């Protein structure tokens, strides 16, 4: 069963508009196609076109990505599957905007109604909504694990400084599993605990960016939500579901050495070509997320692109990479 791949183009910023930039990207949501102008001036051109599971043009709003991509995944998480969503693309294209979003300016909104909110805050908000009173008892735990230069950092441990690296071990009770020693899991007890947890992470990040060169563009971040669920039948028996969701904001795909990024692409290549050795163990990212790449987790990729002709080569590079990734076969199953 193919993983899901979608594409999102960012809108032009002030600078580009001021320059009367014209888009080289066309997304047709009916055909589910992205089409890129690769040459030719006005009245005759070359184009490259690619079909994906969905396509989101530059005017697409957060709410629409959330309804289309995330809603059905969260439903699956709530059924007790593990899911992963990746954001993939060059720096500046909207990976973080998609996975996190931002605040609407001038304190126009509370966080729960901000139309610029992204996947993470909307998902956490929605979990409490969907499970308010349906007879499922539940707890929600989050962790935020980052990988930079092949070291692991915990962005939510409030009593460790950002300099302290975690260690990873194989998890003996699990072929596909690792243990991250020391990784804080924070219980989010209700919707009114969410925002401040997101705040503490962001502050812990600022610090990281100060210590580590080009941190925000070279790091991979894995924001995990684990939902432990318990139903009681009419006969008093207990039904347990556990769902895990990984929300991954990857390092920029552009262009010193990102071992985890290089390995991710080599993992995809091995999977699509069906070669029997898949090099998961060659990087921390791919050991942690091994079950997401041709294993038992339902995976989606959101590949983010630019409308600007300056970014032509990296745009094509992302589309090609994303398009190949569609042939990855996963076998989701209940926990
Ligand atoms: N769909 C969008 N709508 C409005 N602004 C966007 C969108 N996508 C990206 N941006 C803006 O583009 C800039 C870079 O986006 P960012 O999320 O940091 O990209 P990345 O994480 O891929 O480097 C930011 O100013 C962000 O606000
Ligand atoms: C609260 C912050 C300091 C700044 C910020 O915009 C975000 C943060 C950190 N983190 C989340 S994951 N995305 C966004 C976010 C969170 C909630 C609502 C929103 O519109 C955006
Ligand atoms: Mg980013
Ligand atoms: Mg990142």
Curated annotation (Swiss-Prot):
Compartment list: Cytoplasm; Cytoplasm, Cytoskeleton, Spindle pole
Domain Kinesin motor: residue ranges: 2-328
Post-translational modification note: A subset of this protein primarily localized at the spindle pole is phosphorylated by NEK6 during mitosis; phosphorylation is required for mitotic function.
Residues engaged in binding ATP: 89-96
Modification N6-acetyllysine, positions: 130
Stated role: Motor protein required for establishing a bipolar spindle and thus contributing to chromosome congression during mitosis. Required in non-mitotic cells for transport of secretory proteins from the Golgi complex to the cell surface.
Record: disease: Microcephaly with or without chorioretinopathy, lymphedema, or impaired intellectual development: An autosomal dominant disorder that involves an overlapping but variable spectrum of central nervous system and ocular developmental anomalies. Microcephaly ranges from mild to severe and is often associated with mild to moderate developmental delay and a characteristic facial phenotype with upslanting palpebral fissures, broad nose with rounded tip, long philtrum with thin upper lip, prominent chin, and prominent ears.
Family the UniProt entry places it in: Belongs to the TRAFAC class myosin-kinesin ATPase superfamily. Kinesin family. BimC subfamily.
Subunit and partners: Interacts with the thyroid hormone receptor in the presence of thyroid hormone. Component of a large chromatin remodeling complex, at least composed of MYSM1, PCAF, RBM10 and KIF11/TRIP5. Interacts (via C-terminus) with the kinase NEK6 in both interphase and mitosis. Interacts with RARRES1 and AGBL2. Interacts with TPX2.
Name of the featured protein: Kinesin-like protein KIF11
Species for this entry: Homo sapiens
Full protein: residues contained: 17 to 366 of 1056
């Amino acid at each position: 069963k193919n993983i899901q791949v979608v594409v999102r183009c960012r809108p032009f910023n002030l600078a580009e508009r001021k320059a009367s930039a014209h888009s080289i990207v066309e997304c047709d949501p009916v055909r589910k196609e992205v089409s890129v102008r690769t040459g030719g001036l006005a009245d005759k051109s070359s184009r490259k076109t690619y079909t994906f599971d969905m396509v989101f043009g530059a005017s697409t709003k957060q709410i629409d990505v959330y309804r289309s991509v995330v809603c059905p995944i969260l439903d699956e998480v709530i059924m007790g599957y593990n899911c992963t969503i990746f954001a993939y693309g060059q720096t500046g294209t909207g990976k973080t905007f998609t996975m996190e979003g931002e605040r609407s300016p001038n304190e126009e909104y509370t966080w729960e109604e901000d139309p610029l909110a992204g996947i993470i805050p909307r998902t956490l908000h929605q979990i409490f909504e969907k499970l308010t009173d349906n007879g499922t008892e539940f707890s929600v735990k989050v962790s935020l694990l980052e990988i930079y230069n092949e070291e692991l950092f915990d962005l939510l441990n409030p009593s460790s400084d950002v300099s302290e690296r975690l260690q990873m071990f194989d998890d003996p009770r699990n072929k596909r599993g690792v243990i991250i020693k020391g990784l804080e899991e924070i219980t989010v007890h209700n919707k009114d605990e969410v925002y401040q947890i997101l705040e503490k992470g962001a502050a812990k990040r600022t610090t990281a960016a100060t210590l580590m060169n080009a941190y925000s563009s070279r790091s991979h971040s894995v924001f995990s939500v684990t939902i432990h669920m318990k139903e009681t039948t009419i006969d008093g028996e207990e039904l347990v579901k556990i769902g895990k969701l990984n929300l991954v904001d990857l390092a920029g795909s552009e262009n010193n050495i990102n071992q985890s990024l290089l390995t991710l692409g080599r993992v995809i290549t091995a999977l699509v070509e069906r070669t029997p050795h898949v090099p998961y163990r060659e990087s921390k990212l791919t050991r942690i997320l091994q079950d997401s790449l041709g294993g038992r987790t339902r995976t989606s990729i959101i590949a983010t692109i630019s409308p600007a002709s300056l970014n032509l080569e990296e745009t094509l590079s992302t589309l090609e990479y994303a398009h190949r990734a569609k042939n990855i076969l996963n076998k989701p199953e209940v926990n």
